[PDB]
Design a protein around this ligand. Structure first.
Ligand SMILES: CCCCCCC[C@@H](O)CC(=O)SCCNC(=O)CCNC(=O)[C@H](O)C(C)(C)COP(=O)(O)OP(=O)(O)OC[C@H]1O[C@@H](n2cnc3c(N)ncnc32)[C@H](O)[C@@H]1OP(=O)(O)O
Ligand SMILES: CCCCCCC[C@@H](O)CC(=O)SCCNC(=O)CCNC(=O)[C@H](O)C(C)(C)COP(=O)(O)OP(=O)(O)OC[C@H]1O[C@@H](n2cnc3c(N)ncnc32)[C@H](O)[C@@H]1OP(=O)(O)O
Lengths: 272, 272
């Protein structure tokens, strides 16, 4: 379950989240401040091989076509996140909860340096799966940040910014590891009850992450709920509330349809 | 000297050349017509290890910073080009010719399938190197197509298309293998007497090739002279003439400055 990556991966990922040559630190591997947007650490989800599917042991009548990314939580334990090297990931179940004819499963992971043993990333993916069953069980504990609902305060955001999503971004973003046909193949997306392919939840998430970093700087911790779908070609609106010296609460909206794509979300800033 | 590549490399390359999700044949690995734009075969130039620099052994006063891609010839011998596998490449010098304080050097290569021995690609790369010296020598015979002038006919073009070059295109394109700082680092480009980083010769070429394919179909042989620089953010204009059942002659102009970027160029269409 070893993920091998280098600056090519870093740059291909950063570019997909909107890094331009105005920011050589994200797109040029020899730049003095070369760095990867920390949501990159989620990619153990897709590049750890067969063991990454171990959540499915707990599901009855699982059709991957009907799976949606429901929430994601990511912690970077070792700062800054590496731009090259080797990471070994170990997976474990956290919880399964029936929601009507749906299931919500929480899949937990730890990602270490495969050379040294050093803890680098921790992830908790939550899937919302339609027409699926599972036992009502809790298996493991979670950090508070991961279950914080991070309700936006009832006041205007301290910061707001629009982020265009290219019609072709899913095709580029998916090269980072998530080959799900759902986001590229119209006939597959049609079988999952969408009128055309949708945008990877983790893409919206990274686009939001990137926008927040330009404004508030780097973070080592992130959690969010995917509350509504995004299509390639649409324009996102990232709303940000600075709730402490440390913590930025946010929402990502779809300008075009007036829905909320990301809710119950926050980042925790690395300090100085 | 083994290049390992797969659908990811293919799609990453296709996108940099302007392939969109309207063309799933170029950007989705499970499309039944999944295929790579054949200029992909030049990439042995960058993905074959240290032996690929062997041309420099014939050079005196060589500074890589002062190197420019001068001409390029590619033949595809095995149709269609593979979208995954392993290719072993071997290189030979073809010619060195001093032009005043410059050197023109031609670097020959054959790229086989590493498992089978099958000739996949052949390349002839011509570099124009400023402030360089070399002997006046001819080492090898060359195909007619590689040395053809392909004079643009006097009549009006049969076909004409504009191809906009994103200002960020260099940053994506170079992930296909060519890591030269000339195209990304403004400081290095300044050392080369360019007011901003230039676009990769092979990108202009691939962009041009892509546009030619959308109109004329697939080709298995291509040759072009790089006669003018291109800057990312500029608009290319491809000019084309059908000169036989086999052969399409072209040029690529830079609209913004009224220069000729690619001249003395043709493609050989794939048969029936
Ligand atoms: C190899 C590993 C593979 C793993 C990665 C897989 C590949 C990935 O590429 C997949 C993707 O990227 S898919 C795209 C990203 N996600 C989305 O777009 C989801 C957008 N949100 C929605 O369509 C709805 O919130 C929707 C449809 C999810 C739910 O909305 P509703 O149908 O209106 O459900 P609702 O009636 O609101 O809620 C029922 C109960 O579920 C809880 N809940 C709601 N949304 C949730 C969510 N997003 N995550 C977790 N739980 C959620 C509610 O609390 C409710 O519970 P309760 O009744 O106890 O209050
Ligand atoms: C393993 C790793 C290897 C890596 C390899 C490559 C890595 C890459 O990153 C490199 C790139 O992509 S660099 C960018 C691409 N190239 C360009 O943009 C060049 C555009 N062309 C020019 O600026 C000029 O034609 C220019 C500057 C090239 C020449 O024009 P001039 O200085 O005006 O010279 P001129 O008076 O026109 O001619 C002098 C003699 O040189 C010959 N010549 C001219 N252009 C040539 C060319 N493009 N190719 C070959 N020979 C050329 C002329 O024939 C003339 O010789 P003669 O008088 O005997 O005929």
């Amino acid at each position: 379950p070893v993920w091998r990556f280098d600056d090519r991966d870093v740059i291909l990922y950063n570019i997909a989240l909107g890094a331009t040559t105005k920011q050589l630190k994200y797109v040029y591997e020899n730049d003095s401040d070369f760095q990867v947007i920390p949501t990159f650490g989620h990619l153990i989800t897709f590049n750890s091989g067969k063991s990454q599917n171990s959540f499915a042991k707990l599901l009855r009548n699982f059709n991957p076509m009907l799976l949606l990314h429901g929430e994601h939580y990511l912690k970077v334990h070792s700062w800054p996140p590496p731009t090259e090297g080797e990471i070994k990931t170990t997976f474990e179940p956290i919880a399964t909860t029936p929601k009507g004819t749906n299931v919500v499963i929480v899949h937990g992971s730890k990602s270490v340096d495969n050379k040294s043993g050093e803890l680098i990333y921790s992830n908790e993916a939550t899937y919302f799966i339609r027409n699926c069953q599972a036992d009502n069980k809790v298996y493991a504990d979670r950090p508070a940040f991961a279950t914080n609902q991070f309700l936006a305060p009832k006041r205007a955001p301290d910061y707001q910014v629009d982020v265009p999503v290219s019609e072709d971004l899913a095709a580029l973003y998916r090269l980072s590891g998530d080959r799900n046909p759902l986001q590229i193949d119209p006939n597959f997306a049609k079988g999952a009850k969408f009128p055309k392919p949708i945008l990877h939840g983790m893409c919206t998430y990274g686009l939001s992450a990137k926008a927040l970093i330009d404004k508030f700087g780097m973070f080592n911790e992130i959690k969010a709920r995917f509350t509504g779908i995004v299509f390639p070609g649409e324009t996102l609106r990232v709303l940000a509330w600075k709730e402490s010296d440390d913590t930025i609460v946010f929402q990502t909206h779809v300008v075009d349809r007036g829905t909320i794509a990301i809710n119950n979300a926050a980042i925790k800033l690395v300090g100085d």
